[PDB]
Tab-separated table of C-alpha atoms (C1' of nucleotides) in Angstrom:
chain	number	residue	atom	x	y	z
X	1	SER	CA	-22.249	49.582	-17.078
X	2	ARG	CA	-20.816	46.512	-15.355
X	3	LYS	CA	-18.718	46.394	-12.193
X	4	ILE	CA	-16.012	43.840	-11.384
X	5	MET	CA	-14.547	43.638	-7.870
X	6	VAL	CA	-11.002	42.283	-7.774
X	7	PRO	CA	-10.364	39.974	-4.798
X	8	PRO	CA	-7.230	39.728	-2.602
X	9	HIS	CA	-5.875	36.773	-4.611
X	10	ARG	CA	-4.697	39.096	-7.424
X	11	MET	CA	-4.285	42.438	-5.655
X	12	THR	CA	-0.632	43.501	-6.209
X	13	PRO	CA	-0.491	41.469	-9.451
X	14	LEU	CA	-3.217	43.717	-10.854
X	15	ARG	CA	-1.405	46.716	-9.332
X	16	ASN	CA	1.769	45.940	-11.283
X	17	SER	CA	-0.338	45.580	-14.448
X	18	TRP	CA	-2.555	48.590	-13.625
X	19	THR	CA	-1.594	50.251	-16.916
X	20	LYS	CA	-0.009	47.277	-18.696
X	21	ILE	CA	-3.370	45.776	-19.684
X	22	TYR	CA	-5.368	49.034	-19.415
X	23	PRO	CA	-3.779	50.605	-22.514
X	24	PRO	CA	-4.429	47.516	-24.653
X	25	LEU	CA	-8.153	47.252	-23.893
X	26	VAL	CA	-8.522	51.033	-24.302
X	27	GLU	CA	-6.857	50.712	-27.725
X	28	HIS	CA	-9.041	47.840	-28.945
X	29	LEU	CA	-12.365	48.466	-27.175
X	30	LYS	CA	-12.068	51.841	-25.340
X	31	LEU	CA	-14.263	51.077	-22.347
X	32	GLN	CA	-14.705	53.888	-19.820
X	33	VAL	CA	-13.110	52.463	-16.677
X	34	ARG	CA	-10.632	53.572	-14.040
X	35	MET	CA	-8.654	51.985	-11.188
X	36	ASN	CA	-11.205	52.816	-8.489
X	37	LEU	CA	-9.232	51.177	-5.685
X	38	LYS	CA	-11.193	53.018	-2.968
X	39	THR	CA	-13.970	50.384	-3.139
X	40	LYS	CA	-11.569	47.786	-4.676
X	41	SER	CA	-13.812	47.522	-7.747
X	42	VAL	CA	-13.642	48.823	-11.315
X	43	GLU	CA	-16.744	50.003	-13.170
X	44	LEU	CA	-16.564	49.674	-16.973
X	45	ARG	CA	-19.041	51.266	-19.384
X	46	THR	CA	-19.316	51.987	-23.100
X	47	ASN	CA	-17.627	55.201	-24.188
X	48	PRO	CA	-19.674	57.910	-25.959
X	49	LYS	CA	-17.522	57.767	-29.114
X	50	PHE	CA	-16.458	54.089	-29.119
X	51	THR	CA	-19.722	52.214	-28.473
X	52	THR	CA	-19.631	50.324	-31.784
X	53	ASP	CA	-19.971	46.920	-30.076
X	54	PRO	CA	-22.603	46.089	-27.419
X	55	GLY	CA	-20.547	43.038	-26.417
X	56	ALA	CA	-17.390	45.092	-25.927
X	57	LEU	CA	-18.568	45.964	-22.416
X	58	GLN	CA	-19.317	42.266	-21.871
X	59	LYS	CA	-15.989	41.110	-23.336
X	60	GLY	CA	-13.979	43.567	-21.267
X	61	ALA	CA	-15.862	42.480	-18.149
X	62	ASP	CA	-14.906	38.854	-18.861
X	63	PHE	CA	-11.238	39.848	-19.196
X	64	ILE	CA	-11.579	41.880	-15.985
X	65	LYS	CA	-13.137	38.808	-14.361
X	66	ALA	CA	-10.298	36.726	-15.788
X	67	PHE	CA	-7.684	38.969	-14.166
X	68	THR	CA	-9.713	38.947	-10.921
X	69	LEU	CA	-10.056	35.159	-10.856
X	70	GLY	CA	-6.337	34.644	-11.525
X	71	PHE	CA	-5.986	34.172	-15.320
X	72	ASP	CA	-2.788	35.637	-16.755
X	73	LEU	CA	-2.423	38.352	-19.390
X	74	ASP	CA	-1.904	35.669	-22.048
X	75	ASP	CA	-5.368	34.329	-21.209
X	76	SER	CA	-6.623	37.922	-21.133
X	77	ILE	CA	-5.164	38.400	-24.617
X	78	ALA	CA	-7.010	35.196	-25.519
X	79	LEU	CA	-10.041	36.725	-23.788
X	80	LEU	CA	-9.723	39.590	-26.281
X	81	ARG	CA	-9.635	37.100	-29.168
X	82	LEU	CA	-12.460	35.048	-27.625
X	83	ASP	CA	-14.528	34.345	-30.761
X	84	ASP	CA	-14.604	30.671	-29.669
X	85	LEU	CA	-13.896	30.452	-25.928
X	86	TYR	CA	-15.773	30.051	-22.665
X	87	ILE	CA	-14.982	30.271	-18.949
X	88	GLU	CA	-16.848	28.327	-16.267
X	89	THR	CA	-15.914	28.931	-12.618
X	90	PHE	CA	-17.092	25.641	-11.116
X	91	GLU	CA	-15.978	25.648	-7.480
X	92	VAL	CA	-16.026	22.986	-4.767
X	93	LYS	CA	-19.247	21.504	-3.277
X	94	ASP	CA	-20.810	21.148	-6.728
X	95	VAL	CA	-19.669	17.543	-6.814
X	96	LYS	CA	-19.802	17.732	-3.034
X	97	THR	CA	-17.585	15.691	-0.738
X	98	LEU	CA	-16.042	15.931	2.721
X	99	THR	CA	-14.416	19.316	3.303
X	100	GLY	CA	-11.889	18.019	5.849
X	101	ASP	CA	-9.344	15.261	5.316
X	102	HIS	CA	-10.952	14.035	2.069
X	103	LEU	CA	-10.699	17.523	0.544
X	104	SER	CA	-6.987	17.599	1.407
X	105	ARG	CA	-6.577	14.203	-0.256
X	106	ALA	CA	-8.575	15.516	-3.209
X	107	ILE	CA	-6.227	18.503	-3.360
X	108	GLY	CA	-3.323	16.045	-3.461
X	109	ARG	CA	-5.156	14.008	-6.102
X	110	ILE	CA	-5.870	17.048	-8.279
X	111	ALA	CA	-2.274	18.293	-8.109
X	112	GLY	CA	-0.641	14.873	-8.331
X	113	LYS	CA	3.144	15.173	-8.418
X	114	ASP	CA	3.180	18.836	-7.316
X	115	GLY	CA	0.849	20.140	-10.012
X	116	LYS	CA	1.886	17.517	-12.569
X	117	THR	CA	-1.614	16.066	-12.902
X	118	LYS	CA	-3.160	19.528	-13.243
X	119	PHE	CA	-0.570	20.483	-15.875
X	120	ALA	CA	-1.193	17.205	-17.728
X	121	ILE	CA	-4.975	17.612	-17.632
X	122	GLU	CA	-4.604	21.213	-18.820
X	123	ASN	CA	-2.237	20.438	-21.703
X	124	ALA	CA	-3.810	17.230	-23.011
X	125	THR	CA	-7.459	18.311	-22.857
X	126	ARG	CA	-6.510	21.784	-24.240
X	127	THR	CA	-7.791	23.956	-21.425
X	128	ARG	CA	-6.550	26.452	-18.830
X	129	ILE	CA	-7.558	25.200	-15.393
X	130	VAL	CA	-7.265	27.770	-12.614
X	131	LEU	CA	-7.483	25.236	-9.776
X	132	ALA	CA	-7.604	26.915	-6.377
X	133	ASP	CA	-8.077	25.132	-3.037
X	134	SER	CA	-11.821	25.072	-3.794
X	135	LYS	CA	-12.440	27.009	-7.044
X	136	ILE	CA	-11.700	25.599	-10.506
X	137	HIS	CA	-11.923	28.311	-13.171
X	138	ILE	CA	-11.644	26.361	-16.424
X	139	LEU	CA	-11.294	28.273	-19.713
X	140	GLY	CA	-11.571	26.740	-23.159
X	141	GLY	CA	-13.879	25.664	-25.942
X	142	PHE	CA	-17.298	24.049	-25.586
X	143	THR	CA	-16.037	20.484	-25.984
X	144	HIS	CA	-12.913	21.432	-24.025
X	145	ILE	CA	-14.842	22.717	-21.003
X	146	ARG	CA	-17.066	19.604	-21.120
X	147	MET	CA	-14.019	17.335	-21.225
X	148	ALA	CA	-12.481	19.397	-18.432
X	149	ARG	CA	-15.723	19.108	-16.448
X	150	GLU	CA	-16.036	15.356	-17.004
X	151	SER	CA	-12.416	14.784	-15.979
X	152	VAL	CA	-12.606	16.694	-12.695
X	153	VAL	CA	-15.803	14.915	-11.640
X	154	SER	CA	-14.027	11.642	-12.441
X	155	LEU	CA	-11.169	12.239	-9.994
X	156	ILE	CA	-13.367	13.489	-7.138
X	157	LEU	CA	-15.712	10.497	-7.470
X	158	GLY	CA	-12.998	7.833	-7.517
X	159	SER	CA	-11.084	6.268	-10.379
X	160	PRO	CA	-7.661	4.570	-10.699
X	161	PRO	CA	-4.726	6.585	-12.089
X	162	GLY	CA	-4.286	4.257	-15.061
X	163	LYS	CA	-7.945	4.725	-16.004
X	164	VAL	CA	-7.777	8.535	-16.102
X	165	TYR	CA	-4.275	8.746	-17.624
X	166	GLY	CA	-5.518	6.452	-20.347
X	167	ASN	CA	-8.604	8.670	-20.563
X	168	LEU	CA	-6.772	11.985	-21.016
X	169	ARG	CA	-4.775	10.362	-23.825
X	170	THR	CA	-7.806	9.364	-25.838
X	171	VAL	CA	-9.889	12.493	-25.213
X	172	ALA	CA	-6.882	14.462	-26.462
X	173	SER	CA	-7.219	12.596	-29.792
X	174	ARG	CA	-10.992	12.975	-30.089
X	175	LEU	CA	-11.074	16.768	-29.971
X	176	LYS	CA	-7.890	17.207	-32.006
X	177	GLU	CA	-9.356	15.098	-34.814
X	178	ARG	CA	-12.585	16.446	-36.270
X	179	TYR	CA	-13.623	14.390	-39.320
V	1	A	C1'	45.169	-25.040	78.641
V	2	G	C1'	47.303	-27.134	74.242
V	3	A	C1'	54.577	-32.598	66.700
V	4	U	C1'	54.583	-37.911	66.647
V	5	U	C1'	52.458	-43.067	66.531
V	6	U	C1'	48.496	-46.829	65.677
V	7	G	C1'	45.170	-49.123	62.506
V	8	G	C1'	39.744	-49.264	60.130
V	9	A	C1'	36.274	-47.637	56.203
V	10	C	C1'	35.304	-43.497	52.178
V	11	A	C1'	38.772	-45.305	49.109
V	12	A	C1'	40.164	-40.855	44.328
V	13	A	C1'	43.229	-41.847	40.067
V	14	C	C1'	45.404	-46.090	37.729
V	15	U	C1'	46.853	-51.401	36.322
V	16	U	C1'	44.994	-56.177	34.666
V	17	G	C1'	41.721	-59.328	32.359
V	18	G	C1'	36.409	-60.907	32.255
V	19	U	C1'	31.305	-59.430	31.395
V	20	C	C1'	27.250	-57.009	28.858
V	21	A	C1'	25.870	-52.924	25.677
V	22	U	C1'	27.148	-49.076	21.948
V	23	U	C1'	28.596	-47.513	17.388
V	24	U	C1'	31.363	-47.508	13.131
V	25	A	C1'	35.987	-49.273	9.508
V	26	G	C1'	37.673	-51.472	4.440
V	27	A	C1'	35.213	-54.643	1.577
V	28	G	C1'	32.311	-58.711	-0.855
V	29	G	C1'	26.373	-61.094	-0.505
V	30	A	C1'	19.775	-60.988	-2.039
V	31	A	C1'	15.968	-57.456	-2.207
V	32	C	C1'	13.197	-52.611	-2.331
V	33	U	C1'	12.880	-47.205	-3.477
V	34	A	C1'	14.485	-42.929	-6.297
V	35	A	C1'	16.737	-41.495	-11.109
V	36	U	C1'	-1.318	26.929	-8.063
V	37	U	C1'	-1.637	32.492	-6.928
V	38	C	C1'	-2.267	37.069	-3.443
V	39	C	C1'	-1.021	37.930	1.356
V	40	G	C1'	0.239	38.984	6.149
V	41	U	C1'	4.250	36.675	8.820
V	42	A	C1'	9.216	33.778	12.673
V	43	G	C1'	14.031	31.942	11.196
V	44	G	C1'	17.204	33.659	8.029
V	45	U	C1'	19.238	33.892	3.102
V	46	G	C1'	25.863	37.489	0.532
V	47	A	C1'	20.489	39.809	-1.371
V	48	A	C1'	16.431	38.729	-4.097
V	49	C	C1'	13.756	35.442	-1.977
V	50	C	C1'	13.579	30.579	0.528
V	51	U	C1'	12.600	27.263	4.856
V	52	G	C1'	7.949	28.015	8.720
V	53	C	C1'	2.736	29.797	10.828
V	54	G	C1'	-2.082	31.673	9.660
V	55	G	C1'	-5.819	33.391	6.040
V	56	A	C1'	-8.210	33.286	1.148
V	57	A	C1'	-11.027	32.829	-3.795
RNA sequence: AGAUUUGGACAAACUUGGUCAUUUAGAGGAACUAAUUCCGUAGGUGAACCUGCGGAA
């Protein structure tokens, strides 16, 4: 009985995959939903013959929110197999700073060498970071989201590059090793 | 109206020695020192799409 409104940041990308991801979720979960592009929002509800999971409407809404927020179909496939996964859409002005020239320098600091720092922080800390100009939709495990959250508040607050690059090395070891 | 001769000093430059001063030459004398995506959207790109502007979510 939920409704997810797709924004303009994934409009035609969802239009190309209008039936590419629709047939997979209908096969696995069978949620009653249609491409109601008149209001630019899709309402998903439990079907009368396939309501065997109360969380299937919640899990499909998270994958619909993943496609709306910009996560790819590989993450949406991981959103289907989300027995241990979590998504937190922490945007800007949570760790608030100046929205003018300092935010542009923070955007350069988050990207690094044209997205190299964001790709390194995503790969080493084992997370998918959908970093917009202001929104950061991080997807991963409970320790992975926490390590993603602690790393992004480190760079906005001020730390040297050798401190954080040393830090993403050793937090990569601490979650990969469990005993 | 408008060539030559007659001698004075400035006397250049030079000769000759003297004078004082300046260096240094080859040596030998005693010391001292050192060793991202979705867009609209101009130029175009063989054409996709890129170089540009603006927005966002």
